[PDB]
Design a protein around this nucleic acid. Structure first.
Ligand SMILES: [Mn+2]
Length: 301
DNA sequence: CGTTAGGTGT
């Protein structure tokens, strides 16, 4: 389950929360950031993501000697690509309300696996014989940010895998990515994440259910209504489209994406949110004690 | 500065 958002100088204010949104989270200190990608290795980046270096690379400052010029209108300058890997809602509820670190490890492994596959799609433009050509570079600079809450204050385990708009070419020059291949492969990269996550959840003893219509899975001990109760943003987007005389099918991803920000809302202690999750789960009659190594293995092969 | 397009909705 992957979403791709292009971060430009116009909408860069959507990143203000990469660090603050994780404070007092359940598993943020065991941390919530990591440098990934062979490109990051080349730049000597590893471990936790420091805000100083992140902001430098965001604007194209690779070092004091090298600054990229990715504009011709700087307002439309592309700074990176937010690759958001979200876990299934039921998976989030079990990991965050009941509490199972094993699910956090699976999500991080599935994200790391998905980032590695994405690297095989990195492309850049050179010039040969006066003509412009395209080459495969096989390196990306990725800073991941793991969050536990949605904009509607629901449990939503997801990681922002921020891909800088830079790739090192064969000649050593750092240049802007040719994103075409990455955009076309959104669903494939989500499948890599889903496949790894499902395999790890199965090894942990969770019964999963499969939806062949949209090629997704989730926990099998949650009803379609119990999951809906913790999916307020999806409801807000459906109500938003309904106001436009549209449904999730009649609407295009172009408009549906804008309904997310337009419906998006802008102070509550994390202690309050967590307790609210438990009580609500108790109101719905949810029993989280369901890691018992049972089920018919619906998401096996 | 176009291009992707599970709804859980980044
Ligand atoms: Mn987030």
């Amino acid at each position: 389950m992957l979403d791709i958002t292009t971060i430009t100088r116009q909408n860069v204010t959507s990143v203000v929360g990469y660090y603050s949104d994780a404070k007092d989270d359940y598993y943020s200190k065991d941390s919530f950031t990591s440098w990934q990608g062979t490109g990051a290795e080349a730049l000597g980046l590893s471990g936790d993501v420091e805000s100083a270096r992140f902001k430098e690379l965001l604007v194209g400052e690779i070092d004091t000697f090298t600054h990229m010029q990715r504009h011709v209108d700087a307002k439309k300058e592309r700074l990176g690509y937010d690759l958001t890997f979200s876990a299934p809602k039921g998976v989030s509820m079990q990991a965050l309300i009941h509490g199972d670190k094993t699910i956090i490890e699976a999500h991080e492994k599935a994200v790391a696996a998905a980032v590695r596959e994405a690297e095989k799609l990195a492309q850049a433009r050179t010039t040969r014989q006066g003509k412009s050509v395209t080459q495969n570079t096989n390196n990306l600079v990725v800073a991941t940010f793991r969050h536990e809450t949605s904009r509607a204050l629901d449990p939503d385990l997801h990681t922002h895998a921020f891909v800088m708009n830079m790739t090192q070419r064969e000649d050593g020059q750092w240049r802007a990515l040719k994103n075409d291949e990455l955009m076309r492969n959104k669903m494939h990269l989500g499948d890599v994440y889903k496949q790894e996550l499902a395999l790890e959840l199965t090894k942990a003893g969770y019964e999963l259910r499969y939806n062949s219509k949209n090629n997704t899975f989730d926990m099998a001990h949650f009803s379609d209504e119990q999951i809906r109760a913790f999916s307020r943003r999806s409801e807000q987007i459906e109500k938003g489209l309904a106001a436009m005389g549209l449904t999730r099918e009649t609407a295009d991803a172009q408009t549906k994406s804008r309904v997310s920000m337009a419906t998006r809302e802008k102070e509550h202690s994390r202690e309050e949110i967590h307790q609210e999750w438990a009580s609500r789960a108790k109101t719905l009659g949810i029993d989280f004690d369901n890691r018992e190594w049972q089920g018919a293995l619906e998401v096996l092969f």
